[PDB]
Amino acid sequence: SHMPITINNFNYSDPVDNKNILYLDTHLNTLANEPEKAFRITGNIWVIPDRFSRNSNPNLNKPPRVTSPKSGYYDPNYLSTDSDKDTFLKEIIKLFKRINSREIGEELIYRLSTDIPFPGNNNTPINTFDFDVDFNSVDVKTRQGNNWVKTGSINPSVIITGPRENIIDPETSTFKLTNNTFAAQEGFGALSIISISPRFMLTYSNATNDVGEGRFSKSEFCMDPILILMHELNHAMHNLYGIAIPNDQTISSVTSNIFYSQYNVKLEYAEIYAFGGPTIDLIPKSARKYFEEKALDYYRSIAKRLNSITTANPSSFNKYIGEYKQKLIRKYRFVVESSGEVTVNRNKFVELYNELTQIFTEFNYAKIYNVQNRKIYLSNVYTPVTANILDDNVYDIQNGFNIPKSNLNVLFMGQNLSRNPALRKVNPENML
Numbered sequence: 001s002h003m004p005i006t007i008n009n010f011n012y013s014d015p016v017d018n019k020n021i022l023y024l025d026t027h028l029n030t031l032a033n034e035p036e037k038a039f040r041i042t043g044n045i046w047v048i049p050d051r052f053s054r055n056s057n058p059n060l061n062k063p064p065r066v067t068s069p070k071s072g073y074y075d076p077n078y079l080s081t082d083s084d085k086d087t088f089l090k091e092i093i094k095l096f097k098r099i100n101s102r103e104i105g106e107e108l109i110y111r112l113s114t115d116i117p118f119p120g121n122n123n124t125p126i127n128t129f130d131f132d133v134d135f136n137s138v139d140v141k142t143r144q145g146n147n148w149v150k151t152g153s154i155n156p157s158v159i160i161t162g163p164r165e166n167i168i169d170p171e172t173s174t175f176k177l178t179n180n181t182f183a184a185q186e187g188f189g190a191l192s193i194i195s196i197s198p199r200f201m202l203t204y205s206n207a208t209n210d211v212g213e214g215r216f217s218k219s220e221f222c223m224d225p226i227l228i229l230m231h232e233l234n235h236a237m238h239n240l241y242g243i244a245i246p247n248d249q250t251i252s253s254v255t256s257n258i259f260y261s262q263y264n265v266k267l268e269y270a271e272i273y274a275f276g277g278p279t280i281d282l283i284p285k286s287a288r289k290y291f292e293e294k295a296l297d298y299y300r301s302i303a304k305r306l307n308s309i310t311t312a313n314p315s316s317f318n319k320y321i322g323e324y325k326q327k328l329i330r331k332y333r334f335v336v337e338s339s340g341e342v343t344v345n346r347n348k349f350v351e352l353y354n355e356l357t358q359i360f361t362e363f364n365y366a367k368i369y370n371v372q373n374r375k376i377y378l379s380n381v382y383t384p385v386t387a388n389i390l391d392d393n394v395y396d397i398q399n400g401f402n403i404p405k406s407n408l409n410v411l412f413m414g415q416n417l418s419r420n421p422a423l424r425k426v427n428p429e430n431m432l
């Protein structure tokens with residue numbers, strides 16, 4: 001993470017500086033009627049503290065019908081006020097600082113904020129770098145009179161936004177034009193948008209760390225907000241490096257929550273990798289190998305493109321083709337022959353692929369950050385809880401909820417619902 005990562009600090013009210021604070025138009029948020037104020041966390045990672053939706057005629061109100069069994073929490077007013085956005089913004093910032101407190105987290109942030117999606121998709125000519133492909137380029141706008149006019153654009157690799165309709169259903173996605181295929185699943189990679197609210201914590205009893213309650217009554221624990229966020233950052237990693245597995249690749253399983261006893265769910269392989277651990281073995285070995293080989297082929301195709309670039313879009317990028325060729329070579333860890341030809345080194349690929357799918361995983365983070373966490377992705381869940389994580393007496397960068405000062409550092413008591421009064425169940429009125 002070669003040059004030490006530092007997280008920027010912001011107040012939602014801080015003025016636009018045309019550098020780290022700008023108004024953007026992603027052309028993707030159906031809830032947005034005008035440009036959205038955005039803040040640069042670090043490098044190419046931005047945050048827009050607004051609710052986000054992809055549904056036409058979006059509605060954030062609690063649904064009358066009850067699809068489910070998936071647990072849901074709805075509040076049409078969450079993040080509606082600037083005061084709300086300021087708190088959300090500061091929460092995301094604080095979580096990034098905590099993530100950045102451990103080596104693996106610093107590297108995770110370094111990669112997501114430094115490496116970029118290959119500029120192009122399946123339909124990009126072999127000799128072209130297209131920095132405007134699909135939704136990779138976001139418009140920068142400024143108010144002129146009573147209107148908003150485009151003054152330029154930026155290429156974020158990851159944009160964090162507030163939740164979509166279901167506040168307790170974090171969602172990471174990439175986007176494409178109708179006639180294209182997902183570049184995130186084809187080696188190129190693409191811009192990711194993560195809609196989430198880490199302070200709304202999932203609760204569970206089937207945990208990774210034994211706290212000696214097996215023969216008695218097991219306590220309910222909350223997920224540390226950084227793992228909820230890091231789980232999605234893992235999806236962003238897969239998307240950035242173009243190794244995302246299509247969501248139609250699933251394994252039929254079961255799980256349960258507060259309102260519904262054991263029910264069926266199509267567990268996505270994408271989620272299995274984001275979680276990590278032994279769970280990865282749920283994916284047939286032959287299938288795991290298939291996706292890895294498919295990725296390698298897409299990588300070989302990328303190297304081929306790099307040996308053919310002669311033009312760029314927009315034209316202003318033509319003079320920087322060499323610079324970006326070099327950046328992409330470093331991203332994919334390709335090798336440059338004495339002849340200057342770019343080639344793929346399988347040993348390097350295998351190492352990278354393994355890092356992206358088995359080291360940068362929620363399961364691994366739980367151990368590294370020494371926090372209690374669900375034992376499996378489908379651990380049964382209870383009523384979600386929340387807390388004032390900006391209050392260092394409740395949650396700090398070094399120990400999260402397990403603060404020694406509060407005497408909550410033993411057996412993950414800070415995460416134990418029955419031992420930490422700072423943890424409170426979310427409004428039952430908004431649950432579904």
Ligand SMILES: [Ca+2]
Pocket residue numbers: 132134135136137138139
């Ligand atoms: Ca664009």
Ligand code: NA
Pocket residue numbers: 169170171172
């Ligand atoms: Na999700």
